[PDB]
């Protein structure tokens, strides 16, 4: 509110809204996968994982999340699914 | 604390702001401080010519 | 309806926290004090470094009562508890500089323009 670089405030608020939307979508798909896992079928969990894997990769690639975050999401999920059946 | 008032003649009173320095008296057991004359309402002694910076006396220009 | 022995709260930042009305000023045999009324208070509690000390006696004006105020349209505006704004004893001139909680339109006076301007509502 002091320096004209206070447009970083409105800019950061807009970017916060946008990043919140993308984060909520990504984690909604991860929760899709995890709920499908707790339900106990391999095919449904694998469907949801194939549906979230482009999402997590496009989010890591865009600067929302980090390559390692998406990496370990996919890793723990594939491990859970493989032990699940 | 109590403190010594040196020199011949002072004009200090009950409500006189002064400036205090260290230095015992060796005479008064319990007086461990001094009063810098010529500073904060302590007036310099009456025309001390020797040791004139001590006792706060400004000099005759002669 | 504030009367003698009423443990009020304090609505300003004068330093007091709990007071007591010791006399309702204005007219003999007066019983109650309305929101606009100036009373006399003894301080029953204060903060350590506040502008007033515990046990001091001075005036005050009321700003909120549980009894509430009534409007010309009949509407009653009650509050959750009693509260006052300490005033210097000779000229009113509230001691504090902040004010907490709402006040009422019954306080929009030539004297409490200060209170009504520092108040967060009404």
């Amino acid at each position: 509110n002091i320096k004209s670089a206070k447009k970083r405030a409105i800019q950061s608020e807009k970017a916060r809204k946008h990043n919140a939307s993308r984060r909520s979508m990504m984690r909604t798909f991860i929760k899709k996968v995890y709920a499908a896992i707790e339900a106990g079928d391999k095919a449904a969990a694998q469907k949801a994982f194939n549906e979230m894997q482009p999402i997590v990769d496009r989010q890591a690639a865009k600067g929302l999340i980090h390559k390692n975050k998406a990496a370990r999401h996919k890793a723990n999920l594939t491990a859970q699914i493989n032990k699940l059946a | 604390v109590t403190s010594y008032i040196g020199g011949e003649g002072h004009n200090l009173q009950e409500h006189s702001v002064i400036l205090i320095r260290g230095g015992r008296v060796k005479d008064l057991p319990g007086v461990r401080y001094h009063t810098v004359r010529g500073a904060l309402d302590c007036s310099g002694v009456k025309d001390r010519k020797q040791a004139r910076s001590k006792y706060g006396v400004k000099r005759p220009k002669a | 309806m504030i009367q003698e022995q009423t443990m009020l709260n304090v609505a300003d930042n004068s330093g007091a926290r709990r007071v007591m009305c010791i006399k309702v000023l204005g007219g003999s045999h007066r019983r109650y004090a309305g929101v606009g009324d100036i009373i006399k208070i003894t301080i029953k509690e204060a903060i350590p470094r506040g502008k007033v000390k515990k046990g001091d006696v001075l005036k005050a004006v009321v700003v909120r009562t549980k009894k509430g105020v009534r409007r010309p349209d009949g509407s009653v505006i009650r509050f959750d508890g009693n509260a006052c704004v300490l005033l210097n004893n000779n000229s009113e001139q509230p001691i504090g500089t902040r004010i907490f909680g709402p006040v009422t339109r019954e306080l929009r006076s030539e004297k409490f323009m200060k209170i009504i301007s520092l108040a967060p509502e009404v």
């Binding site: - | 009173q13 009950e14 409500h15 702001v17 | -």
Partner: protein
């Protein structure tokens, strides 16, 4: 630079009795608009901060007045409003020398009043060219001509009425000018700011004709050639009328009087025009006399134009609500520029000159440049007291003014909390620098501080300034009167033996001293010790022990506890014991004999008796005489010099601790008293026995 041509500046102040409209006019004078339109510089007017960047109203405002429907270019008129109380009269003392002119405001119904004559004397001391305004024409019982005549006979002035009154009370709508010969009735109905001339009104045409003719005679006697030209049957033009009247108004001839009503805003708009027309400019007022530190008179006339090196005059330190210094400075000659160096030539001290501030249109403008005649204020640390010069290192050191009023009322003072004596010391230290007409004291009867001020209100608006400025509370009191005691006409031949020998080394002393009183002040030391011991009865190396043990009791005194002066002593006969007699034996024996011979030598208690001279108007002679006799005071001659009566009376000091405020009530504020201690005498009062054990038993 000095774009507003300096030869146009008018430096002036309005002075009057209390509630006379000086503050009302100051405010009205300031309706200069010039917002949404710089009116100056034929560029950069003060208009930038007419945008109200900093909002405040301050003393000594500057203003641009072009003219009331007849206009002639921006003039920065510089205005110092003046207060009206004798209490605080130093603000009128300092702000009259600093002034070039003066608008002598007056109440059209009150007329001239104690303060009006008082400020008249103030201006006469500086010979200030003064024109007069006559405010309050709407009040019932107000008449311009009567107050005009009052000036002619109450002040001994020549009040030329360059205006006239159109009605009184409600009637007042305009004023008949004697040179325009028109009477402009202002458009107060829409706004006073709007104005309109009217040709030759019938109501005052006979009165105006005779009074206007009187004005032309003054214009005539104004110049010798003009007088003869006035005897030529020819009238005077729009320049010889004013230029004749003006050119000596500069030199203290006649005071121009205009009527108006700053409440209804008429008369005033014209009053500003008269100030430009007749009141002096720094280039019109004669050049200032000057002097150096040693040269009895280095002429040092500092030509006003700022071609001489910077040479100002500082007239008031200020307790600025935020800055804390704000010492206003009036620049006579020279130019100081946003950071320079000048010395306290009256104090022999040196420092820079940092942030000049001139407040105009009530906006506190900050200035990097102050020039000839330009009134401003300075923020600094080093003190410059009122009437102290601010000349360049070139140094026309001393300016002639070395005058401040002596305090007429002195009152004791002490804080409510016993530990704010230091704070009350520092507060009174500051409030003593802020005005020179306020002394602080430390009398030697007791450390009690005495805040000697001019009036009751003067030092009553300072007991609460500590409450306001320095958040310290004080409780005033009557000063303690120095009461010394003595023996009166009873010689006594008494004995005193001090001896406590009940061990190896006791003390033995004895004395027979004949205590007799001396004439009250017949010898410098007051005391007298003659030794008539013979036979070496007391050793004689202990005779000074006796003296030093008697005149140590003179300080204390047996009767009440207060000093003893004017008594003789004769050491008739004593005795000694070689082993036990000691310095502190004839010191104690003499003390004992003193305070047993004093209990039987008829001791009295004496009071200080002043030498009071009162300059009082004739009528109230009997009144002040009777009040001096009300006090236990004795009158000694009352010669009457003209315009006062001189009344001498050696009144006790105890009966004078609020005298002037009461005296002013008795004299209509037209008298002052000067008192100076003379002698001592007695009046039966055990009030001194009342004050014995309350403090220092």
């Amino acid at each position: 630079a000095r774009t507003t041509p300096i030869a146009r500046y008018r430096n002036i102040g309005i002075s009057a009795h209390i509630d006379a409209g000086k503050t009302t006019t100051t405010e009205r004078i300031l309706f200069y608009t010039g917002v949404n339109h710089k009116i100056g510089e034929v560029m950069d007017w003060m208009e930038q901060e007419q945008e109200r960047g900093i909002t405040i109203t301050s003393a000594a405002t500057t203003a641009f007045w072009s003219g009331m429907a007849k206009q002639y270019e921006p003039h920065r008129i510089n205005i110092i409003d003046t207060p009206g109380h004798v209490d605080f009269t130093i603000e009128v003392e300092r702000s009259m020398r600093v002034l070039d002119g003066a608008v002598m405001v007056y109440c059209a119904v009150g007329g001239v009043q104690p303060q009006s004559e008082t400020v008249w004397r103030q201006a006469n001391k500086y010979k200030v060219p003064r024109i007069a305004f006559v405010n309050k024409m709407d009040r019932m019982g107000a008449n311009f001509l009567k107050v005009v005549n009052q000036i002619k006979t109450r002040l001994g002035a020549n009040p030329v009425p360059l205006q006239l009154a159109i009605g009184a009370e409600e009637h007042f709508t305009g004023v008949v000018d004697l040179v325009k010969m028109k009477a402009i009735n202002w458009n107060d109905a829409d706004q006073g700011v709007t104005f309109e001339y009217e040709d030759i009104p019938a109501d005052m045409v006979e009165l105006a004709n005779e009074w206007h003719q009187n004005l032309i005679e003054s214009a005539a006697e104004a110049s010798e050639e003009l007088m003869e030209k006035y005897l030529g049957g020819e009238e005077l033009t729009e320049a010889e009328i004013k230029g004749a009247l003006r050119q000596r108004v500069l030199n203290n001839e006649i005071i121009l009087v205009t009527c108006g009503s700053a409440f209804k805003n008429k008369g005033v708009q014209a009053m500003l025009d008269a100030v430009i027309d007749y009141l002096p400019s720094p280039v019109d007022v004669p050049a200032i006399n000057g002097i150096l530190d040693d040269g009895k008179d280095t002429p040092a006339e500092r030509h006003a134009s700022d071609d001489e090196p910077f040479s100002a005059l500082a007239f008031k330190i200020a307790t600025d609500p935020f800055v804390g210094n704000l010492t206003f400075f009036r620049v006579y000659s020279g130019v100081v520029n946003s950071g320079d160096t000048v010395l306290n030539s009256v104090k022999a001290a040196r420092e820079r000159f940092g942030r000049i501030v001139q407040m105009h249109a009530n906006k506190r403008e900050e200035i990097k440049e102050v020039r000839a005649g330009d009134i401003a204020a300075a923020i600094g640390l080093k003190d410059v007291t009122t009437g102290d010069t601010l000349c360049d290192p070139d140094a026309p050191i001393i300016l002639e003014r070395m005058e401040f009023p002596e305090p007429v009322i002195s009152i004791a003072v002490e804080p409510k909390t016993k530990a704010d004596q230091e704070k009350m010391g520092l507060a009174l230290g500051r409030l003593a620098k802020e005005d020179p007409s306020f002394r602080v004291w430390t009398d030697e009867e007791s450390n009690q501080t005495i805040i000697a001020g001019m009036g009751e209100l003067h030092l009553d608006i300072i007991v609460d300034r500590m409450k306001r400025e320095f958040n310290v509370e004080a409780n005033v009191g009557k000063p303690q009167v120095a009461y010394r005691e003595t023996i009166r006409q009873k010689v006594t031949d008494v004995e005193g033996k001090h001896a406590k020998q009940s061990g190896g080394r006791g003390q033995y002393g004895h004395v027979v001293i004949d205590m007799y009183p001396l004439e009250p002040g017949s010898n410098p030391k007051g005391y007298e010790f003659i030794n008539d011991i013979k036979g070496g009865v007391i050793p004689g190396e202990y005779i000074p022990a006796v003296d030093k043990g008697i005149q140590e009791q003179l300080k204390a005194g047996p009767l009440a506890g207060y000093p003893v002066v004017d008594m003789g002593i004769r050491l008739h006969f004593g005795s000694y014991h070689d082993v036990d007699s000691s310095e502190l034996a004839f010191k104690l024996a003499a003390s004992i004999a003193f305070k047993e011979g004093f209990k039987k030598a008829k001791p009295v208690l004496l009071e200080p008796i002043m030498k009071v001279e009162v300059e009082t108007p004739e009528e109230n002679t009997g009144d002040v005489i009777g009040d001096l006799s009300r006090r236990r005071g004795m009158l000694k001659g009352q010669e009457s010099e003209v315009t006062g009566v001189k009344i001498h009376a050696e009144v006790p000091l105890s009966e004078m601790f609020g005298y002037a405020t009461q005296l002013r009530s008795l004299t209509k504020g037209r008298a002052s008293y000067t008192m100076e201690f003379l002698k001592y005498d007695e009046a039966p009062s055990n009030v001194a026995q009342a004050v014995i054990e309350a403090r220092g038993k």
